[PDB]
Amino acid sequence: FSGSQAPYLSPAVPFSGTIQGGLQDGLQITVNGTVLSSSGTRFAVNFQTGFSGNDIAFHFNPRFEDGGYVVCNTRQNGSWGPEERKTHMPFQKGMPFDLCFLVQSSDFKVMVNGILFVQYFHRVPFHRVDTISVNGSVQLSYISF
Ligand SMILES: CC(=O)N[C@@H]1[C@@H](O)[C@H](O[C@@H]2O[C@H](CO)[C@H](O)[C@H](O[C@@H]3O[C@H](CO)[C@@H](O[C@@H]4O[C@H](CO)[C@H](O)[C@H](O[C@@H]5O[C@H](CO)[C@@H](O[C@@H]6O[C@H](CO)[C@H](O)[C@H](O)[C@H]6O)[C@H](O)[C@H]5NC(C)=O)[C@H]4O)[C@H](O)[C@H]3NC(C)=O)[C@H]2O)[C@@H](CO)O[C@H]1O
């Protein structure tokens, strides 16, 4: 590791932890782990304000359902917005993955196993994000910065 916040090593799922200094343009956050085989049909990574879960700037939510698709959304003052759905599944049940979020001024760039998968254009100010959560059908090796 060569970043500036110590990695969360082998974090238990569900996980919620502080992002030191908050999201910043240029910050890269990696979630590295394995999708579980028979422990649910969904997982999510949430970039959120505090630990309540009612204000999530970016919810990245693969669903092994209806062919496999990924939901991208924002929750503000407790309410979900209109979902962006990509109708391709880049993960696989039982399989290891490397999931990398690069914060840019206009969007998150989301890379799955070294391929840019989606760009989520910010709906709310990313500076207000100070917490990352991961939940659902995954086990994690690390979350790094
Ligand atoms: C004229 C007419 O009659 N028209 C109707 C339409 O109105 C109707 O359309 C449907 O209308 C309903 C409302 O009535 C709704 O809008 C339907 O849309 C669906 O809405 C659901 C619920 O919001 C969507 O599912 C949710 O999606 C969001 C992202 O957008 C999240 O993925 C939600 O997942 C939850 O996420 C939480 C945070 O990560 C998580 O909680 C965490 O869990 C952790 C443990 O793992 C830990 O506990 C932590 O503390 C906690 O915060 C939850 O576990 C997680 N829940 C689940 C179940 O995973 C997700 O629930 C859904 O995607 C959306 N679908 C669509 C298509 O938009 C809308 O379809 C239609 C159809 O009925 O009929 C017409 O006739």
Short mmCIF file of C-alpha atoms and ligand atoms in Angstrom, two decimals:
data_model
loop_
_atom_site.label_atom_id
_atom_site.label_comp_id
_atom_site.label_asym_id
_atom_site.label_seq_id
_atom_site.Cartn_x
_atom_site.Cartn_y
_atom_site.Cartn_z
CA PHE A 1 0.00 0.00 0.00
CA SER A 2 1.18 3.51 -0.86
CA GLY A 3 -1.81 5.78 -0.12
CA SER A 4 -2.41 8.27 2.69
CA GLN A 5 -5.13 6.63 4.77
CA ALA A 6 -4.25 3.21 6.22
CA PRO A 7 -6.20 0.42 4.55
CA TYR A 8 -9.05 -1.36 6.27
CA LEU A 9 -7.67 -4.91 6.23
CA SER A 10 -10.05 -7.90 6.19
CA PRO A 11 -13.04 -5.73 7.15
CA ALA A 12 -16.14 -7.69 8.18
CA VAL A 13 -19.30 -7.23 6.10
CA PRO A 14 -21.47 -5.27 6.72
CA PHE A 15 -18.79 -2.58 7.09
CA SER A 16 -18.93 1.16 7.70
CA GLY A 17 -15.82 3.29 8.15
CA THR A 18 -14.59 6.85 7.98
CA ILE A 19 -12.86 8.21 4.88
CA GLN A 20 -10.19 10.46 6.39
CA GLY A 21 -10.44 13.99 4.99
CA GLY A 22 -13.63 13.08 3.10
CA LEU A 23 -13.91 12.42 -0.62
CA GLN A 24 -11.60 14.62 -2.66
CA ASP A 25 -11.08 15.07 -6.38
CA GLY A 26 -8.41 12.56 -7.38
CA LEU A 27 -8.93 10.15 -4.48
CA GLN A 28 -8.98 6.47 -5.42
CA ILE A 29 -10.82 3.97 -3.19
CA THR A 30 -10.43 0.23 -3.78
CA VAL A 31 -12.75 -2.50 -2.51
CA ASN A 32 -11.07 -5.87 -3.02
CA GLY A 33 -12.77 -9.13 -2.14
CA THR A 34 -14.87 -12.06 -3.33
CA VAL A 35 -18.56 -12.35 -4.16
CA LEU A 36 -20.20 -15.03 -2.00
CA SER A 37 -21.93 -17.97 -3.71
CA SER A 38 -25.07 -18.72 -1.70
CA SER A 39 -25.33 -15.76 0.72
CA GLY A 40 -27.71 -13.38 -1.11
CA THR A 41 -28.22 -11.91 -4.59
CA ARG A 42 -26.92 -8.35 -4.08
CA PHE A 43 -24.11 -6.28 -2.64
CA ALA A 44 -23.44 -2.56 -2.40
CA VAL A 45 -20.74 0.01 -1.83
CA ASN A 46 -22.06 3.28 -0.38
CA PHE A 47 -20.30 6.63 -0.30
CA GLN A 48 -22.23 8.43 2.38
CA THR A 49 -22.41 11.32 4.85
CA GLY A 50 -22.06 9.97 8.38
CA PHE A 51 -23.24 6.61 9.63
CA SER A 52 -27.04 7.00 9.32
CA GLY A 53 -27.32 5.76 5.72
CA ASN A 54 -29.98 8.33 4.81
CA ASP A 55 -27.60 10.45 2.76
CA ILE A 56 -25.69 8.34 0.26
CA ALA A 57 -24.03 10.34 -2.51
CA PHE A 58 -23.29 7.18 -4.51
CA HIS A 59 -24.79 3.70 -4.05
CA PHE A 60 -23.14 1.13 -6.36
CA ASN A 61 -25.28 -1.98 -6.24
CA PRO A 62 -24.66 -5.14 -8.32
CA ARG A 63 -27.72 -7.42 -8.45
CA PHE A 64 -27.46 -11.04 -9.57
CA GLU A 65 -31.09 -10.91 -10.70
CA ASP A 66 -33.02 -10.52 -13.96
CA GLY A 67 -29.95 -11.42 -16.02
CA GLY A 68 -27.49 -9.52 -13.80
CA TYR A 69 -27.36 -5.72 -13.67
CA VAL A 70 -25.90 -2.92 -11.59
CA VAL A 71 -27.85 -0.09 -9.94
CA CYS A 72 -26.26 3.32 -9.42
CA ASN A 73 -28.20 5.81 -7.31
CA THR A 74 -28.17 8.61 -4.74
CA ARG A 75 -30.15 8.83 -1.50
CA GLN A 76 -30.85 12.36 -0.17
CA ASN A 77 -32.68 13.17 3.05
CA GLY A 78 -33.71 9.50 3.21
CA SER A 79 -35.13 9.24 -0.32
CA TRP A 80 -33.74 7.35 -3.31
CA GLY A 81 -33.49 9.10 -6.67
CA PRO A 82 -34.03 7.72 -10.18
CA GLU A 83 -31.83 4.65 -10.69
CA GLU A 84 -29.18 4.39 -13.37
CA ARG A 85 -29.01 0.74 -14.44
CA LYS A 86 -26.28 -0.91 -16.44
CA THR A 87 -27.66 -4.19 -17.82
CA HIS A 88 -24.32 -6.03 -17.68
CA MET A 89 -22.85 -7.89 -14.69
CA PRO A 90 -19.04 -7.61 -14.43
CA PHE A 91 -18.87 -9.65 -11.19
CA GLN A 92 -19.55 -13.35 -10.70
CA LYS A 93 -20.82 -15.29 -7.72
CA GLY A 94 -17.97 -17.08 -5.97
CA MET A 95 -15.31 -15.02 -7.78
CA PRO A 96 -12.66 -12.54 -6.56
CA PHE A 97 -12.90 -8.92 -7.72
CA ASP A 98 -11.03 -5.65 -7.62
CA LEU A 99 -13.39 -2.68 -7.54
CA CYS A 100 -11.86 0.80 -7.83
CA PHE A 101 -13.59 4.16 -7.49
CA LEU A 102 -11.77 7.22 -8.81
CA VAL A 103 -13.29 10.55 -7.75
CA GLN A 104 -13.22 13.18 -10.49
CA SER A 105 -14.70 16.69 -10.52
CA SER A 106 -17.77 15.63 -12.56
CA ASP A 107 -18.12 11.92 -11.76
CA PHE A 108 -16.96 8.74 -10.12
CA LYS A 109 -15.08 6.49 -12.52
CA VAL A 110 -15.75 2.88 -11.49
CA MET A 111 -13.28 0.19 -12.59
CA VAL A 112 -14.00 -3.51 -12.19
CA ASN A 113 -11.02 -5.85 -12.61
CA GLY A 114 -9.08 -3.15 -14.45
CA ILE A 115 -11.84 -2.16 -16.89
CA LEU A 116 -13.81 1.08 -16.66
CA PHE A 117 -17.35 -0.14 -16.04
CA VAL A 118 -19.42 2.98 -15.38
CA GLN A 119 -19.15 6.74 -14.79
CA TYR A 120 -21.58 8.12 -12.23
CA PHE A 121 -22.00 11.85 -12.56
CA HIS A 122 -22.27 13.54 -9.17
CA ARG A 123 -25.81 14.41 -8.11
CA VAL A 124 -24.75 15.94 -4.79
CA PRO A 125 -21.44 17.46 -3.63
CA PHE A 126 -18.89 14.67 -3.12
CA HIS A 127 -17.01 16.74 -0.50
CA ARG A 128 -19.81 15.93 1.97
CA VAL A 129 -19.00 12.21 1.81
CA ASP A 130 -16.97 11.12 4.83
CA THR A 131 -17.90 7.43 5.19
CA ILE A 132 -17.74 4.25 3.10
CA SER A 133 -20.02 1.26 3.69
CA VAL A 134 -20.06 -2.18 2.09
CA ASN A 135 -22.94 -4.60 2.60
CA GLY A 136 -24.45 -7.77 1.16
CA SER A 137 -23.07 -10.89 -0.44
CA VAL A 138 -19.33 -10.26 -0.34
CA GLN A 139 -16.29 -11.04 1.77
CA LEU A 140 -13.50 -8.43 1.76
CA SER A 141 -9.72 -8.64 1.62
CA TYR A 142 -9.26 -4.86 1.97
CA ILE A 143 -10.57 -1.37 1.43
CA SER A 144 -7.69 0.94 0.47
CA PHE A 145 -7.12 4.60 -0.36
C1 LIG B 1 -49.24 3.94 -11.95
C2 LIG B 1 -48.68 2.74 -11.25
O1 LIG B 1 -49.40 2.02 -10.56
N1 LIG B 1 -47.37 2.50 -11.43
C3 LIG B 1 -46.69 1.41 -10.74
C4 LIG B 1 -45.31 1.87 -10.24
O2 LIG B 1 -45.46 2.89 -9.28
C5 LIG B 1 -44.50 0.70 -9.67
O3 LIG B 1 -43.27 1.19 -9.48
C6 LIG B 1 -42.63 0.89 -8.25
O4 LIG B 1 -43.04 1.82 -7.28
C7 LIG B 1 -42.49 1.57 -6.00
C8 LIG B 1 -43.10 2.53 -4.98
O5 LIG B 1 -44.46 2.22 -4.80
C9 LIG B 1 -40.97 1.72 -6.08
O6 LIG B 1 -40.62 3.04 -6.43
C10 LIG B 1 -40.40 0.77 -7.13
O7 LIG B 1 -39.09 0.95 -7.36
C11 LIG B 1 -38.23 0.10 -6.64
O8 LIG B 1 -38.02 0.67 -5.35
C12 LIG B 1 -37.22 -0.14 -4.52
C13 LIG B 1 -37.24 0.45 -3.11
O9 LIG B 1 -36.66 1.73 -3.13
C14 LIG B 1 -35.81 -0.26 -5.15
O10 LIG B 1 -34.99 -1.10 -4.36
C15 LIG B 1 -34.03 -0.34 -3.62
O11 LIG B 1 -33.12 0.28 -4.51
C16 LIG B 1 -32.16 1.07 -3.83
C17 LIG B 1 -31.35 1.84 -4.86
O12 LIG B 1 -32.20 2.61 -5.70
C18 LIG B 1 -31.31 0.17 -2.92
O13 LIG B 1 -30.59 -0.77 -3.70
C19 LIG B 1 -32.21 -0.56 -1.93
O14 LIG B 1 -31.51 -1.46 -1.23
C20 LIG B 1 -31.28 -1.27 0.14
O15 LIG B 1 -30.07 -0.54 0.31
C21 LIG B 1 -29.74 -0.29 1.68
C22 LIG B 1 -28.46 0.54 1.71
O16 LIG B 1 -27.39 -0.13 1.07
C23 LIG B 1 -29.66 -1.59 2.51
O17 LIG B 1 -29.68 -1.31 3.90
C24 LIG B 1 -28.46 -1.69 4.57
O18 LIG B 1 -28.37 -3.09 4.80
C25 LIG B 1 -27.19 -3.44 5.50
C26 LIG B 1 -27.08 -4.96 5.62
O19 LIG B 1 -26.76 -5.56 4.38
C27 LIG B 1 -27.16 -2.77 6.87
O20 LIG B 1 -28.25 -3.22 7.66
C28 LIG B 1 -27.26 -1.26 6.72
O21 LIG B 1 -27.41 -0.64 7.97
C29 LIG B 1 -28.48 -0.91 5.87
O22 LIG B 1 -28.50 0.48 5.64
C30 LIG B 1 -30.86 -2.51 2.28
O23 LIG B 1 -30.62 -3.79 2.83
C31 LIG B 1 -31.17 -2.64 0.80
N2 LIG B 1 -32.39 -3.42 0.63
C32 LIG B 1 -32.45 -4.43 -0.24
C33 LIG B 1 -33.76 -5.15 -0.36
O24 LIG B 1 -31.49 -4.78 -0.93
C34 LIG B 1 -33.34 -1.30 -2.66
O25 LIG B 1 -34.25 -1.82 -1.71
C35 LIG B 1 -35.94 -0.86 -6.55
O26 LIG B 1 -34.68 -0.98 -7.19
C36 LIG B 1 -36.90 -0.01 -7.38
N3 LIG B 1 -37.12 -0.55 -8.71
C37 LIG B 1 -37.21 0.26 -9.77
C38 LIG B 1 -37.52 -0.41 -11.08
O27 LIG B 1 -37.05 1.48 -9.72
C39 LIG B 1 -41.12 0.95 -8.47
O28 LIG B 1 -40.72 -0.07 -9.35
C40 LIG B 1 -44.54 -0.51 -10.61
C41 LIG B 1 -43.86 -1.76 -10.05
O29 LIG B 1 -44.40 -2.10 -8.78
O30 LIG B 1 -45.89 -0.84 -10.90
C42 LIG B 1 -46.52 0.19 -11.64
O31 LIG B 1 -47.77 -0.30 -12.09
#
